[PDB]
């Protein structure tokens, strides 16, 4: 309680080393959204952390 999961709106294939790939519906906890467009996140599927394009997720 007191936190929000995010969900992927679309599939995404990561292209750069620090980025996560994911499929539509995958759930995330956001770790840092303060440094621009690309948010640091943890996939709740894999447990991996990396950047995701913020326009590809929305709050649950």
């Amino acid at each position: 309680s007191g936190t929000t999961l995010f969900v992927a709106l679309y599939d995404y294939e990561a292209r750069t080393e620090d980025d996560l790939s994911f499929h539509k519906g995958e759930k995330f906890q956001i770790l840092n959204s303060s440094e621009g467009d690309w948010w640091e996140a943890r996939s709740l599927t894999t447990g991996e952390t990396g950047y995701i394009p913020s326009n590809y997720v929305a709050p649950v």
Binding site: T16, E17, D19, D37
Partner: peptide, 10 residues
């Protein structure tokens, strides 16, 4: 992978 560098200014 992914293999490409992440640009530091992104």
């Amino acid at each position: 992978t992914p293999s490409l560098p992440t640009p530091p200014t992104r």
